[PDB]
Subunit: 293 residues, 4 copies
């Protein structure tokens, strides 16, 4: 079962921008400890697009060694290139991941038929692991229609859709057309509303530092406690407001650093460092979250 | 009391000659009242105000007031590109006894934010006491405001509410967080349930004319913590919206109301065209379903 | 000329302190444009602040401009409104006043199907009673984004004799010319006039022609004689002015310059348009001086 | 002449074999083909070279081979841009080692970087270019990065920047850039508006279609220089008939196909996800190759 609340994993680096293996392992265990349902590895949040294929494979392998069998593992193997995506898909299979995922190839304009074959090819290389289609127009620049999304999710081998879109009319339409589809809400800031619209879970960057809040929203809605669901979402959004100001990945890494999970809170260039004017708020947030749970 | 609630965006019935059908207008107002609607938003996009003259818009305002003043809440959309024209309608809404005025951000010409603010100020002055409902609808106006700009508009002297026709529910939550007492109407019918959850405390929509009770049912369900009921109702509303978008929203609604014996002639004004005859069976069946449901 | 090709100024509508039409200034502006050697005037469009004017006010301007310039220069009446019926009323008036053609922006605000847009133009053409129609494509303001195929269909509708192309896409400008060798095609963005002509436009309609139309005529002439350098220098000078007008506000900046040229009595635009920022007056006054000396 | 970057330069394609691997023989043939039609230089490793579906070592291999074939004969610009600053720096150092005349980098994409981050990205690559002028690359349609004129002005005035490849159809901005930077090397990016772009202020251009008809673009430059507007328009019109076709067929694969018929490229395939050319377009593509060879 792929339904659930899963954190989009960050990739810790050292002062020289190389992978910090010890912090990667610590972050994986940290997520498992807070009760996350699984991890989405090698996606936007893992800074995969500023990593080489071998670096992405190194991360996939380490995460699997640390969490395989404990929580669900989804490997985002998407690249612009189909061949590169296939290589990562085959490696994900070798490492024992539960599923693979791929963002719609970007930069170059591709036809819908080309997108479809891209997914089919990756699915073939995944050799048995279900595919999680990844729709994120804001970053990819690829704007799919409802009909096209329906076609992609019905392709043989596709078992889920990560929907990073704020269009909750479309979210409802997708659920209506696919009653059994695993549908992950992609924008943390509308999680509650996304679930109400039809999503049955979610994948997000902020889950790394407060995943229990999202689990709390799932529970609140299940119990019909709208008040609690809204309060939790509101608190999540106060945090998201901050992270958007500071820079999301580096802000999260900085909080995790103050929690003693991540040794060095740096992202790879061109991402810059966190503006020191935000440290007081980030330190206070880490303290608050550590006390909270 | 207050302006919170579920308000239908009133349609303007026309006769075979594109002229106001007074009889059908009155029937539609009473029809909405009987559905349990909290009020009516008159003279906005749904009323085809932008293809009507000022005199025609005033006529609709006056008649609706005669039919519902004192029974339900009445909000008059007096917005025009012109500030002076908007002011004229504002003065008329006051004269007819409306509860509030509203104005879409002036469109077509690119205006600076300062000009948008002064526009609202001038209309509020002419509204002579009636609270202003700011109207954010980027998809149609082409005006894209930032959260900071929206906060400034809703805090202008005389503003008492915001009609938020935006599918951005992160911003909906941000607005609620910044203005806990603000009257906030969800503008897109298709995400009503999610909009309320995010922070809206009511809504204004075109489809309320034929199934307002369903939206009232969503408010009740969420209030009683009945998530499934709220979702099921929203799903049903969206099945209707799917159809209406295919047929054309205003004319599709008028056609359903026609089969409900409310609107004599379901036509919209040109350039709007007629409903494709192939959709009549579905619209008639829908009208039948709704009537049996209500 | 026995055709509609040429350089036509998009006429501004002078108002008094009460924001009411200033007839004396309107007449002066019309004569001023004729004196500049303009080929014609495009009346009642964006630049005339038509969308903050009533139907009767738009008609009043049409009548006056006709009284002043009919038979002297070409006159195109922009009768476009969101409403088809309202557009038809203005079309009938334009015919009665003796305008040479009518024009209409793609109806906006509400989303209309392409078929509805086509019927809209057909209806107005019917009311124009013989006057040719100038289709008006201006996506930036109207929000209507037509494809090349749709534009081709619109320009070939019975009764259509021209297209005002307010688009910065010069690939599409060339494609339109390639598909319609005889079509009258007006470049709409003053700031790319020279390049627009090179791409295929055979004339233009613009707001800034009101204060320096002779520069645009100079560009047409320069290109006709193969004097690229002169064409570029003129376009550059036009853009220096356009840079300023965009900062000050185009319509009010233009009106202010005209005020200093003793053409417009009160350089005000109608609300929500605000007044010019006094900090710009020095530059605007200097520009007026320069333009007058240039003549 | 020795250091001048102004001119008409083809955005080089990367020929592959049936297995999607680099076809060195065809790459060499394509370089010579461009030199023979009088091109002023080559822009290598950009969008057109399918760089974003190539690995760093593959991009370096192409850079090295092109240098061996054309260094000293025509100008060579190495597009070393990657989303990652470190990868870009690696390519920049290699470009200098191979003897390129300049480097270039597209604004990093996918992730929403701040303007300050874009600036530091360019500064870092410029440092690694150790002497080679930088050609800023503005192409919003593909990168999704929309810069303001003020931001473009800041970028082109960074120490070490000697040019800007402007892939934008906004000719008002093209003129504004020329007015603000009278000595800046400004390349028109959209082939379909080349003539108008030069008139607006560009002093040269870089484009994909130059690979099959570069002499036409040189013809437009000469025409405008001589004041022959009719000839300039005629050439642009013929170029646009071709561009209309390539947009329908797929630009890179359509070009490779024409080059295959001109006996330059062995196998005209692009790398997946790019699909093959729809066979219904082969008649026009073959006829185009015949026409161009006749013309040349």
């Amino acid at each position: 079962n792929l339904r659930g609340v899963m954190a989009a994993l960050l990739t810790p680096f050292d002062q020289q921008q190389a992978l910090d293996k010890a912090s990667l392992r610590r972050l994986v265990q940290f997520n498992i400890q807070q009760g996350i349902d699984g991890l989405y590895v090698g996606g936007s949040t893992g800074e995969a697009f500023v990593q080489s294929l071998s670096e992405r494979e190194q991360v996939l392998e380490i995460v699997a060694e640390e969490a395989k069998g404990k929580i669900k593992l989804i490997a985002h193997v998407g690249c612009v290139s189909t061949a590169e995506s296939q290589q990562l898909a085959a490696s994900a299979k070798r490492y024992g991941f539960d599923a693979v995922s791929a963002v719609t190839p970007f930069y170059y304009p591709f036809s819908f038929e080309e997108h479809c074959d891209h997914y089919r090819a990756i699915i073939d290389s995944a050799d048995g692991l279900p595919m999680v289609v990844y729709n994120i127009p804001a970053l990819s620049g690829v704007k799919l229609t409802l009909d096209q999304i329906n076609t992609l999710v019905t392709l043989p081998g596709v078992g889920a859709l990560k929907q990073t879109s704020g269009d909750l009319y479309q979210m409802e339409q997708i659920r209506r057309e696919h009653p059994d589809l695993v549908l992950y809400n992609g924008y943390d800031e509308i999680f509650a509303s996304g679930l109400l619209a039809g999503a049955d879970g979610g994948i997000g960057s902020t889950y790394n530092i407060m995943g229990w809040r999202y689990q709390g929203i799932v529970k609140a809605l299940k119990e019909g406690d709208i008040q609690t669901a809204q309060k939790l979402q509101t608190e999540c959004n106060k945090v998201i407001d901050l992270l958007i100001k500071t820079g999301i990945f580096r802000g999260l890494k900085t909080v995790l650093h103050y929690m003693d999970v991540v040794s060095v809170p740096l992202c790879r260039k061109p991402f810059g460092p966190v503006d020191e004017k935000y440290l007081p708020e980030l330190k206070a947030l880490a303290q608050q979250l550590m006390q909270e749970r």
